Design an enzyme around this catalytic site. Sequence first.
Site, short mmCIF file in Angstrom:
data_model
loop_
_atom_site.label_atom_id
_atom_site.label_comp_id
_atom_site.label_asym_id
_atom_site.label_seq_id
_atom_site.Cartn_x
_atom_site.Cartn_y
_atom_site.Cartn_z
CG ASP A 136 -1.91 1.12 1.23
OD1 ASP A 136 -2.27 1.63 0.15
OD2 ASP A 136 -2.29 1.52 2.34
CG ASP A 359 -8.38 -5.13 7.17
OD1 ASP A 359 -7.34 -5.84 7.19
OD2 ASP A 359 -9.38 -5.42 6.50
O1 LIG Z 1 -2.03 -7.81 10.24
C1 LIG Z 1 -0.83 -7.48 9.57
C2 LIG Z 1 -0.57 -5.98 9.56
O2 LIG Z 1 -1.72 -5.27 9.12
C3 LIG Z 1 -1.51 -3.88 8.94
O3 LIG Z 1 -2.68 -3.22 8.42
C4 LIG Z 1 -2.86 -3.42 7.03
C5 LIG Z 1 -4.37 -3.54 6.79
O4 LIG Z 1 -4.74 -4.89 6.97
C6 LIG Z 1 -4.85 -3.04 5.42
O5 LIG Z 1 -6.25 -2.96 5.47
C7 LIG Z 1 -4.36 -1.65 5.04
O6 LIG Z 1 -4.17 -1.49 3.59
C8 LIG Z 1 -5.21 -0.77 2.90
C9 LIG Z 1 -4.98 0.75 2.85
O7 LIG Z 1 -4.95 1.32 4.14
C10 LIG Z 1 -6.04 1.47 2.01
O8 LIG Z 1 -5.76 2.85 1.91
C11 LIG Z 1 -6.16 0.88 0.60
O9 LIG Z 1 -7.31 1.49 -0.04
C12 LIG Z 1 -7.27 1.52 -1.45
C13 LIG Z 1 -8.22 0.44 -1.98
O10 LIG Z 1 -7.57 -0.81 -1.87
C14 LIG Z 1 -8.65 0.64 -3.43
O11 LIG Z 1 -9.82 -0.11 -3.68
C15 LIG Z 1 -8.90 2.09 -3.83
O12 LIG Z 1 -9.07 2.10 -5.27
C16 LIG Z 1 -9.63 3.30 -5.77
C17 LIG Z 1 -8.57 4.03 -6.61
O13 LIG Z 1 -7.64 4.66 -5.76
C18 LIG Z 1 -9.15 5.07 -7.56
O14 LIG Z 1 -8.18 5.52 -8.47
C19 LIG Z 1 -10.31 4.49 -8.35
O15 LIG Z 1 -10.79 5.54 -9.21
C20 LIG Z 1 -11.61 5.10 -10.27
C21 LIG Z 1 -13.08 5.19 -9.84
O16 LIG Z 1 -13.39 4.10 -8.99
C22 LIG Z 1 -14.06 5.21 -11.01
O17 LIG Z 1 -15.33 5.59 -10.54
C23 LIG Z 1 -13.60 6.15 -12.13
O18 LIG Z 1 -14.45 5.99 -13.25
O19 LIG Z 1 -12.29 5.81 -12.50
C24 LIG Z 1 -11.32 5.99 -11.48
C25 LIG Z 1 -9.94 5.70 -12.07
O20 LIG Z 1 -9.45 6.87 -12.70
O21 LIG Z 1 -11.28 4.00 -7.44
C26 LIG Z 1 -10.86 2.93 -6.61
C27 LIG Z 1 -12.03 2.54 -5.72
O22 LIG Z 1 -12.31 1.17 -5.89
O23 LIG Z 1 -7.85 2.92 -3.37
C28 LIG Z 1 -7.66 2.91 -1.97
C29 LIG Z 1 -6.59 3.96 -1.61
O24 LIG Z 1 -6.98 5.23 -2.09
O25 LIG Z 1 -6.28 -0.53 0.67
C30 LIG Z 1 -5.31 -1.25 1.44
C31 LIG Z 1 -5.67 -2.72 1.31
O26 LIG Z 1 -5.66 -3.02 -0.07
O27 LIG Z 1 -3.22 -1.27 5.82
C32 LIG Z 1 -2.26 -2.25 6.23
C33 LIG Z 1 -1.38 -2.73 5.07
O28 LIG Z 1 -2.18 -3.04 3.96
C34 LIG Z 1 -1.12 -3.23 10.27
O29 LIG Z 1 -0.80 -1.85 10.13
C35 LIG Z 1 0.07 -3.95 10.90
O30 LIG Z 1 0.25 -3.49 12.22
C36 LIG Z 1 -0.13 -5.46 10.93
O31 LIG Z 1 1.10 -6.04 11.31
#
Ligand SMILES: OC[C@H]1O[C@@H](O[C@H]2[C@H](O)[C@@H](O)[C@H](O[C@H]3[C@H](O)[C@@H](O)[C@H](O[C@H]4[C@H](O)[C@@H](O)[C@H](O[C@H]5[C@H](O)[C@@H](O)[C@H](O[C@H]6[C@H](O)[C@@H](O)[C@H](O)O[C@@H]6CO)O[C@@H]5CO)O[C@@H]4CO)O[C@@H]3CO)O[C@@H]2CO)[C@H](O)[C@@H](O)[C@@H]1O
Length: 420
Positions: A136, A359
Amino acid sequence: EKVDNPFEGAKLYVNPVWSAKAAAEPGGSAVANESTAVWLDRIGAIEGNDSPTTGSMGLRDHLEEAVRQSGGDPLTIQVVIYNLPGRDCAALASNGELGPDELDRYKSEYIDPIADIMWDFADYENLRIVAIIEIDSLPNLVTNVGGNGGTELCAYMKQNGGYVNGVGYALRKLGEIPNVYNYIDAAHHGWIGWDSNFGPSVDIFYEAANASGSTVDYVHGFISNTANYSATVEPYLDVNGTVNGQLIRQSKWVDWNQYVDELSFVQDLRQALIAKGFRSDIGMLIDTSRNGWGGPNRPTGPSSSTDLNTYVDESRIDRRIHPGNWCNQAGAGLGERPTVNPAPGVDAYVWVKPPGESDGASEEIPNDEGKGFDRMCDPTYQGNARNGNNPSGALPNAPISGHWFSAQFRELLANAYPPL
Ligand SMILES: OC[C@H]1O[C@@H](O[C@H]2[C@H](O)[C@@H](O)[C@H](O[C@H]3[C@H](O)[C@@H](O)[C@H](O[C@H]4[C@H](O)[C@@H](O)[C@H](O[C@H]5[C@H](O)[C@@H](O)[C@H](O[C@H]6[C@H](O)[C@@H](O)[C@H](O)O[C@@H]6CO)O[C@@H]5CO)O[C@@H]4CO)O[C@@H]3CO)O[C@@H]2CO)[C@H](O)[C@@H](O)[C@@H]1O
Ligand SMILES: [Ca+2]
Ligand SMILES: [Ca+2]
């Protein structure tokens, strides 16, 4: 001289700290001996910090345990490098100890001690360390900088070069160790599957792989779907198909994404990375810890509806409201158990996110881990532009990320696919 696939012909590390948490839940023993990645979520985790997220074992403790478990035969442990300056720049639940201006500390007090410990295990010819590099991070510099939706923190991490340079530093320092296998984090299809996101992510991955003395030769492969929930295969959904005078891509779910699952996405991403100049022998991983979507709500076949959104919503195995719903997702199950070369271009399905670890907290909880309250983990959150202004779909009463979340483990277990 490193093997083509570190997972092939190898026993898989069982994390005793995670194992014990799993077995303590009702029916938990059924998955207690599965392999899960060890996370180095802070400097304290290197030596061992007796924390809620990483228990009493430091890295050396894990690597010594891995050597013990091996029986002198090939054994593979996964280690998550996860402590960049300005970590988690588009979110709050997993902001870390190192601020945006602290690259030098990341290098000297995080990466350097890790590399030193791993160098001490280089004389163990049959120990294989899969280093999973900074979940991420880099895709945030593509999707969360543009202002209209983005964050100033991500914009700053782009301009100072902290993400790119931090990753490149980790790639070289760890990649030059003879038994270390680097996999770069490659988001998932629900993040970077779009036309505007796909290629620019390939670009930044390549940029990072050539930073701080790194070249593509330190990159063994890539991992998608880390700590996320995206379907490996959507069996009843064809991203390019129609219903019945409308495109599947026009549905609320797909929303003009080029992909509806992880497999087709990593396979395409793999080809594009190679064409960009990554090694032709790179392999992809998919984190299948929580993407099973099993149990009584799993569709048994395609919908008979001729309404676009109804066909899609009844046919899809990923049952989330929106693909941007990332936190403690209600109704999720355990996915496919760790498996070697399950598909073309895929080194393994892996359990990187340890099932049952949160998460993020569903409320404000005081901590020393640098983590804030992220509303995407609040069940009552009605959302924002990134998630189509939808309810979070997050599970209630969640603890700080990485902490044990009993309710989530139980549901995940119950909804495992394939069934246990
Ligand atoms: O237990 C072990 C350790 O865990 C650690 O914590 C982890 C935790 O488990 C985890 O959840 C987290 O990781 C997440 C991030 O925090 C989070 O920000 C991230 O969010 C993403 C998301 O995955 C994604 O779906 C989203 O996509 C957007 C995209 O940015 C955008 O461009 C796009 O735009 C389109 C439009 O949708 C559309 O309408 C239009 O027509 O076109 C656009 C394109 O031009 O839209 C999509 C929406 O679907 O982006 C966001 C970010 O902005 O996801 C992560 C998980 O995948 O944090 C930790 C690590 O992963 C603990 O910290 C530790 O202590 C433990 O040891
Ligand atoms: Ca390979
Ligand atoms: Ca709404």
